[PDB]
Amino acid sequence: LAALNAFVSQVLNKYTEVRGSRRLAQQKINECVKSQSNRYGFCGNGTH
Amino acid sequence: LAALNAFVSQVLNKYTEVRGSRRLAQQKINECVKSQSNRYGFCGNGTH
Numbered sequence: 001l002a003a004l005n006a007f008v009s010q011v012l013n014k015y016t017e018v019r020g021s022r023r024l025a026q027q028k029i030n031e032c033v034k035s036q037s038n039r040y041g042f043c044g045n046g047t048h
Numbered sequence: 049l050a051a052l053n054a055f056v057s058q059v060l061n062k063y064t065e066v067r068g069s070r071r072l073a074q075q076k077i078n079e080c081v082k083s084q085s086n087r088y089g090f091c092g093n094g095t096h
Contacts (some may be wrong), residue, residue, distance in 0.1 A: 039079065
């Protein structure tokens with residue numbers, strides 16, 4: 001039972017990073033695929 | 049052995065925060081050091 005608990009407590013921590021990674025994916029889709037953003041150092045190091 | 053496992057599981061979680069902290073540093077270097085960004089509330093509370 002203690003072995004199962006430590007695994008659950010790790011899977012729950014693992015799910016948290018993915019939702020933080022999805023915000024960046026949505027932001028890039030919104031800014032570089034539909035709008036041609038002009039912020040330096042953002043998609044591509046040159047002129048998008 | 050169980051004492052070592054809990055320490056490894058903590059060091060691995062610790063390394064994950066630094067990767068999220070480095071993106072902000074790279075963004076600030078790319079935006080305020082080379083481009084003079086104009087977003088309010090970003091580097092400095094006034095006019096950069």
